Enzyme design. Structure first.
Site, short mmCIF file in Angstrom:
data_model
loop_
_atom_site.label_atom_id
_atom_site.label_comp_id
_atom_site.label_asym_id
_atom_site.label_seq_id
_atom_site.Cartn_x
_atom_site.Cartn_y
_atom_site.Cartn_z
NE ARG A 54 38.10 41.89 40.91
CZ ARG A 54 37.27 42.30 39.97
NH1 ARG A 54 37.42 41.94 38.70
NH2 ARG A 54 36.26 43.09 40.30
CG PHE A 59 39.93 33.00 40.82
CD1 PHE A 59 40.56 32.40 39.74
CD2 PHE A 59 39.08 34.06 40.59
CE1 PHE A 59 40.34 32.85 38.45
CE2 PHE A 59 38.86 34.54 39.29
CZ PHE A 59 39.49 33.93 38.22
CD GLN A 62 42.85 41.33 37.81
OE1 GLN A 62 42.10 40.37 37.86
NE2 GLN A 62 42.58 42.40 37.06
CG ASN A 101 41.69 39.79 28.62
OD1 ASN A 101 40.48 39.77 28.80
ND2 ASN A 101 42.37 38.72 28.21
CG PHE A 112 45.40 36.46 36.60
CD1 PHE A 112 45.11 37.04 35.36
CD2 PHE A 112 45.22 35.09 36.72
CE1 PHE A 112 44.73 36.26 34.28
CE2 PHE A 112 44.83 34.33 35.67
CZ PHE A 112 44.59 34.89 34.44
CG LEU A 121 40.61 32.17 33.22
CD1 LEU A 121 41.48 32.88 34.22
CD2 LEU A 121 39.42 33.03 32.85
CG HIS A 125 42.60 35.70 30.62
ND1 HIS A 125 42.48 36.97 31.16
CD2 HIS A 125 41.34 35.21 30.54
CE1 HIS A 125 41.20 37.21 31.41
NE2 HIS A 125 40.50 36.17 31.04
#
Ligand SMILES: O[C@@H]1CO[C@@H]2C[C@H]1Nc1ccccc12
Length: 164
Positions: A54, A59, A62, A101, A112, A121, A125
């Site tokens: 991903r 952004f 991942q 998660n 990530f 976040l 995270h």
């Protein structure tokens, strides 16, 4: 002393270079240790050979699902999941290394690397490291992602380990 680890990443079998990461064992020892051990493979499993599945431009990138390769899997060196250690470190900008998660207390092996400040976040995270060098390599990874997260080349961690 905090570990220095590396990821050597290819795209369709072509080397992109090496990402070097500092793991903040001085703040999150259990989370740093999990990632360090998955880089060396010393528990018998780890990140070597797995993918960035991903990747979302502007952004993050991942990776770490080395069991199902699609965001559903991975496991920690402690078990299938482990608690959120703390949220002391924050998503302050590009280069932050943080745990993916599936909600509270579901850390496994997915992680990530941020390419932007992901402060929304914070508190959800567990941040546990940052990029020391190779952020240009992270940018190359990012360039093969898309808004849905689907990658346009197969992005593989060809090798990984510990530098100090
Ligand atoms: O057991 C936990 C929760 O389910 C999987 C595997 C492991 N970690 C994780 C992290 C992000 C997304 C999915 C998972």
């Amino acid at each position: 002393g905090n570990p220095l680890v590396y990821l050597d990443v290819d795209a369709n079998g072509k080397p992109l270079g090496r990402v070097v990461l500092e793991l903040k064992a001085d703040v999150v020892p259990k989370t740093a240790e999990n990632f360090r051990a998955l880089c060396t493979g010393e528990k018998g499993f780890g990140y070597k050979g797995s993918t960035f599945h991903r990747v979302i431009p502007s952004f993050m990138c991942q990776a770490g699902d080395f069991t199902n390769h699609n965001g559903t899997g991975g496991k920690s060196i402690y078990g299938s999941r482990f608690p959120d250690e703390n949220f002391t470190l924050k998503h302050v900008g590009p280069g932050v290394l943080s745990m993916a998660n599936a909600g509270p207390n579901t850390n496994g092996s997915q992680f990530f690397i941020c390419t932007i400040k992901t402060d929304w976040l914070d508190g959800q995270h567990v941040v546990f490291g940052h990029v020391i060098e190779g952020m240009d390599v992270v940018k190359k990874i990012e360039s093969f992602g898309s808004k849905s997260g689907r990658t346009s080349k197969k992005i593989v961690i060809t090798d990984c380990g510990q530098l100090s």
